[PDB]
Amino acid sequence: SVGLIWAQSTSGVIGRDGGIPWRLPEDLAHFKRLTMGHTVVMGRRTWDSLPAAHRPLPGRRNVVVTRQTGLVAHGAQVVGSLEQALSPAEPDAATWVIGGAQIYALALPLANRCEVTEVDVDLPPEDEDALAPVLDQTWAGTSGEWLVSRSGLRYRMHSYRRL
Numbered sequence: 001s002v003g004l005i006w007a008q009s010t011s012g013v014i015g016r017d018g019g020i021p022w023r024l025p026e027d028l029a030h031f032k033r034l035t036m037g038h039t040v041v042m043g044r045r046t047w048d049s050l051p052a053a054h055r056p057l058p059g060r061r062n063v064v065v066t067r068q069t070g071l072v073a074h075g076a077q078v079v080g081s082l083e084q085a086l087s088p089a090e091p092d093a094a095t096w097v098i099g100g101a102q103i104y105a106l107a108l109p110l111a112n113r114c115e116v117t118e119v120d121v122d123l124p125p126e127d128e129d130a131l132a133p134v135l136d137q138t139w140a141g142t143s144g145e146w147l148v149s150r151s152g153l154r155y156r157m158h159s160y161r162r163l
């Protein structure tokens with residue numbers, strides 16, 4: 001089982017200036033609960049985007065997709081393709097693809113689940129933004145109710161499964 005997990009603004013922004021252009025502790029806790037104990041697969045720019053206290057993501061096997069021989073920053077297992085990241089895989093569990101836009105694009109044809117956090121922040125897409133992947137007719141989805149964060153931002157979760 002291969003799952004994509006991401007947080008996006010309503011406008012579909014996931015990334016800006018090498019990071020995430022909002023702060024949402026409730027999403028981080030959701031991300032922790034779904035990924036803890038599992039393999040997380042990410043592109044190299046997302047690896048470098050991790051704050052130092054979260055690089056590597058503790059309690060998860062961190063696999064980084066790169067075309068380089070290896071990385072200066074420690075704690076990852078490097079692979080040269082998504083296929084190499086995904087096999088062999090943890091039994092009875094999802095392998096989570098955790099971004100960014102380039103690796104979501106590679107992983108979307110292979111995924112059977114998407115877990116999306118939508119953040120009601122007003123972020124018109126800017127020229128160099130990373131955007132969320134668009135899901136096609138092969139996905140069925142359900143949506144949770146709108147929630148309010150302690151910081152006042154409204155957010156909700158969407159869960160998609162491959163038909």
Ligand SMILES: NC(=O)c1ccc[n+]([C@@H]2O[C@H](COP(=O)([O-])OP(=O)(O)OC[C@H]3O[C@@H](n4cnc5c(N)ncnc54)[C@H](OP(=O)(O)O)[C@@H]3O)[C@@H](O)[C@H]2O)c1
Nearest residue numbers: 006007015016019043044045046066067099100101102103
């Ligand atoms: N909101 C969210 O949920 C979320 C989640 C994750 C990340 N983000 C944001 O997304 C942005 C980063 O995303 P991004 O799309 O720019 O980068 P990315 O997908 O994280 O990483 C791109 C890198 O992956 C490697 N790569 C890409 N395609 C490859 C292939 N076919 N084979 C081998 N390696 C390949 C390359 O590494 P090398 O250059 O090393 O060869 C490439 O530079 C940041 O702003 C980050 O904060 C947001």
Ligand SMILES: CCc1nc(N)nc(N)c1OCCCOc1cccc(CCC(=O)O)c1
Nearest residue numbers: 005006007019020027028031054098099117
């Ligand atoms: C939690 C964001 C997220 N949320 C969901 N739902 N899915 C994801 N794939 C996803 O990104 C995982 C990779 C980035 O991890 C972190 C982890 C901790 C703190 C930050 C701050 C970003 C900054 O300071 O710019 C980023």
